[PDB]
Amino acid sequence: WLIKEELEEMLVEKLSDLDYMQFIRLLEKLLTSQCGAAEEEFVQRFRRSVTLESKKQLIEPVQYDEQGMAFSKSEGKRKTAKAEAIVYKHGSGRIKVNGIDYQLYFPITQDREQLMFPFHFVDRLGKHDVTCTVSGGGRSAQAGAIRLAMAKALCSFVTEDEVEWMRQAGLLTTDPRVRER
């Protein structure tokens, strides 16, 4: 709804709280009735836009390799670890970390669960191939960076609703917590 101060600006007249409330009540009553054309553009005169839609994750464009296979590349960062992942549209669930199989690059089960989290959240385990390169940081930081990179690359092959579900699950947000001086 149009806030009091900008209503004053539109009217070029100072007005109180109670008369603003009365005007808003009348506008709501007009909305409740079967408003026709002139009515709802009249109301739209007094309704601003909430341009804070945070569903603005940038879907990476789909690229094609020389073999004609579709894929998407993305980046991620966790502490000092930085990862870049390529997710293929079709695959058998093979993840290659620095040219090494993920169960060999990540002996600890926690990191493997972190690498699971993105694909499992959207029910496509075993349906994609991942080729990622990670550098810097430690075991957990590298695992988190790779998770973020794979989620951001996997956003391309899922629906917008699934992208939003991943966003609400925290799979597409960079973790800003780092060591403090």
Binding site: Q103, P107, T109, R112, E113, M116, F119, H120
Partner: protein, 199 residues
């Protein structure tokens, strides 16, 4: 009792094994007096490599973690100096069995980085684990690759564990749990067994 020695072996001035005695006696002398245990092992090998050539019996030499023989040891002298594998009689006599200078049997071996000395965790190929000396010793040889479970083997192993009621989590018998186990183990038998152990 069927296998018999062809030489007089002298354990000490008082005790000796005469020619024609059963091999078990030698084994007993190694089991009763540990002082002559290592000497008793080599004799056995010396006999088994020889008699098998005559055709008395078929011999199998199954050495697991064979890469230890031509590597390094973590055993020290009293002067804190390193000891080479060839300076051990037990290791020295077992190398003679790996050479293909005898017939009437087969030599089967398996590599292992688990428990290996001075090897990185991800080294599994023959040359990397054996070393130049080990490869030269075993060469020529037939390598056989052992890989992770294929989908059929993975499904059958999980069905075996389920038939033994070894997966107690309610989501394990379902399909989503099977996908999660497959991903977490990547079909590796050992990782799958360890994960299923505590579920």
């Amino acid at each position: 009792n069927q296998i018999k020695v062809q030489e007089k072996y002298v354990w000490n001035k008082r005790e000796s094994t005469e020619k024609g005695s059963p091999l078990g006696e030698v084994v007993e002398q190694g089991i009763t007096r540990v002082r002559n245990a290592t000497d008793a092992v080599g004799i056995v090998l010396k006999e088994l490599k020889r008699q098998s050539s005559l055709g008395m019996f078929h011999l199998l030499v199954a050495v697991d973690g064979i890469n230890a023989l031509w590597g390094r040891t973590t055993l020290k002298r009293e002067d804190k100096s390193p000891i080479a594998p060839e300076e051990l009689a037990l290791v020295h006599n077992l190398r003679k069995m790996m050479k293909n200078d005898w017939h009437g049997g087969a030599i089967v071996s398996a590599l292992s980085q688990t428990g290996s000395l001075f090897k990185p965790r991800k080294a599994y190929l023959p040359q990397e684990l054996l070393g130049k000396e080990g490869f030269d010793a075993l060469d020529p040889f037939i390598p056989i690759l052992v890989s992770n479970y294929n989908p059929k083997e993975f499904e059958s192993c999980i069905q075996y564990y389920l038939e033994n009621n070894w997966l107690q989590h309610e989501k394990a018998p379902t399909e989503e749990g099977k996908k999660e186990l497959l991903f977490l183990s990547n079909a590796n038998p050992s990782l799958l067994e360890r994960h299923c152990a505590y579920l």
